[PDB]
Amino acid sequence: KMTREETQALIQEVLEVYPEKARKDRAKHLAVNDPSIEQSKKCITSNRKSLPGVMTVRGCAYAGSKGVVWGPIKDMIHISHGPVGCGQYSRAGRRNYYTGTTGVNTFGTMNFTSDFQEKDIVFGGDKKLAKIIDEIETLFPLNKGISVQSECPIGLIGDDIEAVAKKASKEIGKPVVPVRCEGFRGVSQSLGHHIANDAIRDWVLDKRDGQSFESTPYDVAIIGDYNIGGDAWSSRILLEEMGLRVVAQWSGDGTLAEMENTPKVKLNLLHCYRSMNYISRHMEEKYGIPWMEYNFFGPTKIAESLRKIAAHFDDTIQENAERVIAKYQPMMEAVIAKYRPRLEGKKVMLYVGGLRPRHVIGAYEDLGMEVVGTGYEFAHNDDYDRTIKELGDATLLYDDVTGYELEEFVKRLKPDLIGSGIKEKYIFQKMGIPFRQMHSWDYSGPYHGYDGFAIFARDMDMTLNNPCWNKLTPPWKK
Amino acid sequence: KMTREETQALIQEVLEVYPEKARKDRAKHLAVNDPSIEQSKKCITSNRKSLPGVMTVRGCAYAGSKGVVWGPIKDMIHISHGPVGCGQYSRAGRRNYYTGTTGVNTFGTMNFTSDFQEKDIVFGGDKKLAKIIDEIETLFPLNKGISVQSECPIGLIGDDIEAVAKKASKEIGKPVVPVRCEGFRGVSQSLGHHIANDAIRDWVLDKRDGQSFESTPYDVAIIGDYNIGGDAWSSRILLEEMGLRVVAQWSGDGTLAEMENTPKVKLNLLHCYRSMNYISRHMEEKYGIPWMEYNFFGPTKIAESLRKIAAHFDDTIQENAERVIAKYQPMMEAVIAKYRPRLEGKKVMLYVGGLRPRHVIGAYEDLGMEVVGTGYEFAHNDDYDRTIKELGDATLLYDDVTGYELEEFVKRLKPDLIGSGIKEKYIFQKMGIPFRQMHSWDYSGPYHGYDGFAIFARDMDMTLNNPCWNKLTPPWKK
């Protein structure tokens, strides 16, 4: 319904709002897809600093380290190290599901913090940190280890958390992992991923290098699934139905032991490329473990992913993949017959973090829906490269979109549905546009796997076709 | 504190409101206690028709039959026979507690009704009633029997429920009891008690006359305790601690079997004289079972009652009574020490049905409180006779009090607490006068027995000394 030329005119009009410096910058982060482009020319600029004052959706390196990578590890204690804010706002906001007895052997929904006061700013927090670890050993004796998640002030005051950690780990006989994920570092959640992957590399991953382990030919790890609403469990089950043995999940429902055994696996299965390519690459370098990217959103991609994973093994696993796909076909066809007729032809705009802006397109297309706009908060060029093939022609693209831009694009494109985060949800609802949270799954899910797809389809239909959307206009204003 | 002369002047002032006919009548139902009075002359008129239009607190014969005597029998099904009102208003409004599986082997909180329509008025309801009994047998097969509780229309249309019942009982092999408790009969709940006691006499009580039963010298029945908030259970336990064997409870938590075995007991213990003296006297006539009146409100009366009951048996039971009294004295002393200092010297006015207006005075006196006014909805002269010795000198007395009278008396006497029913509760609260329901126990109790008395004392203190009473006057209107 819009030509490339119109989309490009939309971009130019939206940029009129900005001062020159801002405009010049933003012009690099907005694009229209064209697969008839030199695949060596970048389509878009990415992973740059946000402009001041423009209302980015982006978070900080602490979010990507503590909130994303570390926080889900269920049997360790993650200390939010600094003043009280960061840990409180991030307390149980991400549905990285786990099984445990919280406060006793798991700690995921708790907020441990050093709650810095002024004296800690002035005199430093290292002594406080040392005592904290003692207090944790007294009060939470079943913890398998501790992470230290640095907030802005730690770096700025010159605390030496590495020294505290080394001494404390020797004393207590457990990993104490210092993480320099202070929020002034990098531009976004992205650098926190990287810092966190390296903290794992440097302080956890090699602990069992000498040791024997009971291995099998079919041992894999799920890398970069944070089990949002049970996403990883509904993934795991398919991999085990196929005959594989999942030694570890990183880091949804994950444990220290699972991480530590991951160097013994035969294949790393990377779902979220953005967040955990770093450790995947390290593990191929040091241990010779291959890694492959896969996608468990929707039946098309699941089938592709199962067959691809199976072909890395042997004929039996390949046979098994065919059995698993066939078993779930009746279900998938039932889900499509029920919901695809209610969603056929509907247009969607997405805006998410680092993966799902491309990864969920196949699932929408399995319901006859078209993504007419997508973007990322903090993706890199390698993510945009991977997005091109997944996208329709002449699709609008936006990197680190501003509040203003996203609103204007929605007003012009007039999508039937928007998929984004909590800070966006209530804006677009007021505009009368159906909205589904594509981080939190709007307190639903899972969306990964065959079981996930049924819930995804129900939810898109529930919201898109809901009666509430016909009622926004008072009848005496028509 | 008011002189007899002042109280008598209060009565005269209040009566000024009425037309002459009403005045002349009401003047006979208001008195001041004088225990140095006549042996044979009544102090007050009672059990007469209510005046039209004056807002009596009284109910009807259906209330006294279905609501009071029959309703509590847990394993029979009681049909409210007539239009839908009576059964609905009386559904689970009285806390006559029982143990059972309701809908299966017990039926007490359910409303069974013939829900008369106009067709049933015109053509009569006998055919409807016959079908109902069938439908009951189908749907509630564990019922031990059926009662038929007549509402106003049954008598007035000439239905023959006695014929329906006798034929149905033959067929189903269980008692079907027709009760002519239509509300136009008598003047109050009182005649319903009588009709109900006779229906028991005539249709239930003699069924096991021929039969053997395993009896002992210490077998008693509790007659006239309806187990309000467990009142009967906290009574029963003391009787068993004393060495007696309670074969039946009439009719709190009571069953058909218990009633039917009552002719085999050695002693009928009558708590509520008003409601069940009738069947007590029948049982002494026909079976030679003696009956005695007792009182389980407050430690003074309980001790008196236990000793009196024990002296009907043998030295062993009497020794036992002394053991039971001694065992509970430390409790009673603790209750009095805690609560008597908070209630000492406080004045109470009561208005209840047929028993509690005299029976609870002892318990109030055990807490240092004085009843300065009392009265009954539907007592007879024999109840007023029993009240004289229980009352203080120059105490105001009121039979079938009108709304107007009770309000004026309260305004003048200025009691610290009022004990009456749900229709009175919210009137006096608005006047700033602490009020405790003395029918429903204000959803508390039990009040009978030693355990009952501790709850009674807590409740009087809770309400009389509550902070809410200091707050009725806005500070800018003082």
Add this chain to the structure above:
Amino acid sequence: SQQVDKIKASYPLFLDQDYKDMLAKKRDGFEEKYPQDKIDEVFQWTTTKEYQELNFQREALTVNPAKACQPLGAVLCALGFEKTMPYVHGSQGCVAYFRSYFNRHFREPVSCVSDSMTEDAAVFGGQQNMKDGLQNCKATYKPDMIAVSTTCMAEVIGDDLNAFINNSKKEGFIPDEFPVPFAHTPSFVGSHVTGWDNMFEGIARYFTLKSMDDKVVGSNKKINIVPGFETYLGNFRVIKRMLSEMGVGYSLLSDPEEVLDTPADGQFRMYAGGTTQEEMKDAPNALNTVLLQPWHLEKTKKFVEGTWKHEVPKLNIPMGLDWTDEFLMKVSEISGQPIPASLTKERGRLVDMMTDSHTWLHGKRFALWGDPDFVMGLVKFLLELGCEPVHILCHNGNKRWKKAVDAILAASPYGKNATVYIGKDLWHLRSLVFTDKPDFMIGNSYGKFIQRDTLHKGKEFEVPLIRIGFPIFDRHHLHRSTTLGYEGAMQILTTLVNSILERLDEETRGMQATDYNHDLVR
């Protein structure tokens, strides 16, 4: 026994071991109770489709009804008139019950008199009762009006109220000009709502029938509002508030909101507020009359159309979004007052709430009961929210009403699994929530026993009750709520979604078993 520093009431006192033992002996020794296994087996059977079949074949027995009798409604109607005493000609047992029933719902005094007809009057009739009663009532309680209704005794016997009242006047028991409107309110016809209709039409007739000559429609430039049987204070208040915000001149005909909510300030007020007699006398001069609960105001409607000549608009009860919109638009049309910005914003705030809460509401299955207009408004709003009302019960409903509701259901996809039942009771409903289990019940306190029954089959079968309707006896101050207008829709929405979330928290509170979904954020 008791610890005096921690006194136990019936619960949990009777769970003490000594009491348990004593009551186990009572049952075994003396009750001849069926064995537990057999009780279990029969219970099980009451939960089945087979039992449900037998249950729905009942033609004569009613169990656990969901209606009351006419004079209950007559009293409530009468309470809505200034310095009016409700007076029920007939037996006194009735008035004791009516008062108690309302006392327990409103936690307030409820003033009503009987004329205490006895056996003596059962043949000769209650003429003398009426004479002495009217005179006694007037002198004792000093009302300015006595509104007369009847118990079933008086209806059966056939007392002529009109004659008895006129004779009371002729012989000097009460003044000729003292207002004594009346209605026959037979308990064996219709229900409580019918009683309200009959009483209301009686009072309307009393002040307007003989004085029509000088009346001109529209001359006073107001709209009459008849609320019907209404037991939420908020409903009276929200209607007044909305009309005042629009600047619409109105008369609320029967308005008990003051007398059912007097302050506790040291004084008892038998009478407070209420519709004036002047308002009823002048009502034919209104532009028109709006009936808020038309399905129980049919007689009123015929009177208002036939004698007042008002063209009563065809409006549903103003519950939910559409029907509130239509009420306001019609009031706008009749009055000439535009719908103001305040009401427009209030509407959009409701719609905001709907968008915010839709995901939890979508597809939820409800059993529900109540009076016809209430039930259909709740049905309508549930459809607006994307909920499925599976079991819809109106004990006092009729065929014409059921057809109207069936058409509402047929116009929505959310209606596909719904059935409307009339003439069925809560024992019928009990079977439905076993055999075709919904998520929740919406109804009055009587539902608590269905919830208990369902839990006994097992936790996975329990159907929680959400208390909306009348009576509500086991919670405090819910009578202050609202169910009409945008305000009522917001409160209903909130109650529904939070009941859902509360139950989800309960089901996910099991440490290490279900608490994976015990989310902080919903």
Add this chain to the structure above:
Amino acid sequence: SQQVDKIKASYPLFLDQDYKDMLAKKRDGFEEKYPQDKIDEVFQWTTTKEYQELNFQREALTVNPAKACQPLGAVLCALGFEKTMPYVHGSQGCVAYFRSYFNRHFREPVSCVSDSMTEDAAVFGGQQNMKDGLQNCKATYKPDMIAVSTTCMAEVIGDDLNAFINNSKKEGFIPDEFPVPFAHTPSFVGSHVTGWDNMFEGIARYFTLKSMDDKVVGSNKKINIVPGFETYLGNFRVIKRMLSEMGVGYSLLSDPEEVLDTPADGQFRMYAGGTTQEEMKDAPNALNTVLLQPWHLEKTKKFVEGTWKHEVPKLNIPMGLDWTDEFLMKVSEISGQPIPASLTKERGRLVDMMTDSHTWLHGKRFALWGDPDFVMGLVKFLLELGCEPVHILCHNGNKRWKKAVDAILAASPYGKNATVYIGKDLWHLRSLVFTDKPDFMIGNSYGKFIQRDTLHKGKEFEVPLIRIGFPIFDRHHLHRSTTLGYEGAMQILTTLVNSILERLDEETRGMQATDYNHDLVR
């Protein structure tokens, strides 16, 4: 696997056998999980007096705090001003969280910008960020005011806001007369409430400090109202309503109730209502300033007393009966307006409710937490109701506040078993509700996890949560409630009594075991 006509989400999907088996293998094969027995034993130990001892000996660790950081409060304060954009100088991670936290509580958009200071600025400071940020914010979102606060980064490095803003103006990034009030809001001092105080005093200074010459106390005949950090829409509304009813001229200084409740009518409104700049400029001309939450408005108070010369009345938060009475009587005195009939009746209706419900409330034991003013108002009202507040926790409380609460407790018999805790967290509170168990907790959604912990010990130990405070994330639309005035007291009373009755129904729902006390009427 899934039945397509009955699709299961995480709950109860993962309770399916196949998933249970898979997760049992995950745990046993791969997690090296402690044995269940040991988990049980350690759990048990966390419920003990011994564990509580160790717990209260913490000097360095905080677990499950019950406070947030200053700039969160600065943002809320800023949102209460017309066409005002909250601007937080420092790191952008902060603003992402502030927005989300409010989005989740209010289910509304929450507009706030950062200037996105990065490592570049960590040595040199954020001057250029401020210049470009102000310019970008002004052009992109067209606020009439930008209200600047700080993240901890900017505080640590020591950016001079005053100079940076003045330099932004001097060099043409924003116009000279464009309003940019500011405040240092260090997260490592005090809490969110401190941030609100700091921001408010900043804005007050911006519009009044340099223009005091022409001001005369009382000249505009109004009362200023400063609400403080407030997250109930009803609270802003009830204050306005009561003052309007009294005919009192007033200015609510920081009023976000419009922008936190825009209608869903097809248009997104970034800004709505709010206190005007004119109101702030004129505020020194008021008769006086009333502070609704004085325990977090100390800096504001020093400014208002020292520069405006207002004799700020010594008033507690107007929660409960006495303190609402005192607020109204003080406003009456200052304004000369009598307290009207309507408020007098409203008060009496509250008192009525107290008389009606007192028996259920009497002696009930409560643990509770929140901000200082809220907590002490709740304590006060509980004492008015005859309840016992046994565990009183205020993480961000101080010694002066604790002493004031201890005196409130000492003036009532219901205070005898109460202890006030300051600087303690919800892991502390968890121990208290195990060792000295109350009947209920009153607090925010974080309490849900304590309720789960107590249920795991056993049903008889479970302490139910009653959600009053901030944040509330697991229920919908409670942000619309009221906790101030007679209206707020009525809603709190209703919530308390019905929580009690709800829990009693749960405990008495067991067929033939506990349902003897499952009464219809309460």
